[PDB]
Each structure stands twice: as structure tokens, then as C-alpha cells.
Amino acid sequence: YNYLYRLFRKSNLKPFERDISTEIYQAGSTPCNGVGFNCYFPLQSYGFQ
Amino acid sequence: VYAWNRKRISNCVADYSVLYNSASFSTFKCYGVSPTKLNDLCFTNVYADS
């Protein structure tokens, strides 16, 4: 689980843009609040077995 | 669940946003498409299985 990717963002990356931010993504009216329904922690893992 | 009811949905405009405007839905799991994209898309038919 040391290997991760971003699954959600406010806008797409430009060529060679780098963005390590852990801040919560908002998919609807739900404010991020450090957590929810249509709000997400934006980083995910492959879990390679 | 042994005898699930299927409704064919056709010839109509599908406001999928209603299905996540309500706080009542405990789980919402989408496959092949994002829930935000649904109000933009068009389909030959829709089948609602319950």
C-alpha cells in the first residue's frame, strides 16, 4: 500500500504539473469538512499483491 | 430479491441528480460511469432493477 494515485481533482493537470496535496475533494454541495456523501479523500492505492 | 422487479425506462428525460439531492440514500455505487456525468449522457434504453 506504499503505492498511490490521485482519483479526484478540481481541474486536470497541465504537462509536467506535480500536485501532492491531501485536501478533501467535493463532488456536490457537501463541504469537505476534513471528511462524506459526495465528498472524498482524493488519494487511492493499488495494494500490489 | 429471488424475483426482482425490472422496469424498462424509455422515451423520457432522466434527471439523475434527484437520486443524490436527497440525504436518505445510505449507499450510492456507480460502475463504468461517474454519477456527476449522468445528466449529460444519452442512452438507447434504461432498465431499473429493484
What's the 3-state SS for chain B? CCCCCEEEECCCCCCCCHHHHCCCCCCCCCCCCCCCCHHHCCCCCEEEEC
The answer to whether residue A28 neighbours chain B at the CB level (below 8 Å) is: yes
Given the DSSP bridges, would you call strands B46-49 and A39-40 parallel, antiparallel or unpaired? unpaired
Asked if B6 and B46 count as a contact pair (C-beta separation under 8 A), the reply is: no
The answer to whether residue A10 neighbours chain B at the CB level (below 8 Å) is: no
A5 Rama sector, left if φ>0, alpha if ψ -120 to 50, beta otherwise:
beta
Q: Hey, how many other C-beta atoms are within 10 angstroms of the C-beta on B16?
A: 17
Solving technique for this entry?
A: cryo-EM
Residues sharing a CB contact under 8 Å with residue B5, sequence separation 6 or more, in sequence order: B49, B50
Asked if B5 and B49 count as a contact pair (C-beta separation under 8 A), the reply is: yes
H or E element, residue A38: none
- Cα torsion B44, B45, B46, B47 to 10°: value is -140
Q: How far are the Cα atoms of A21, A29, B28, B34, B46 from residue B22, in angstroms, in the given order?
A: 30, 12, 12, 18, 22
Q: How far are the Cα atoms of A5, A20, B10, B28 from residue B48, in angstroms, in the given order?
A: 33, 40, 11, 15
A-B CB pairs within 8 A amount to 8
Residues in A closer than 8 angstroms to B28, CB to CB, are: 37
DSSP single-letter state for residue A15: T
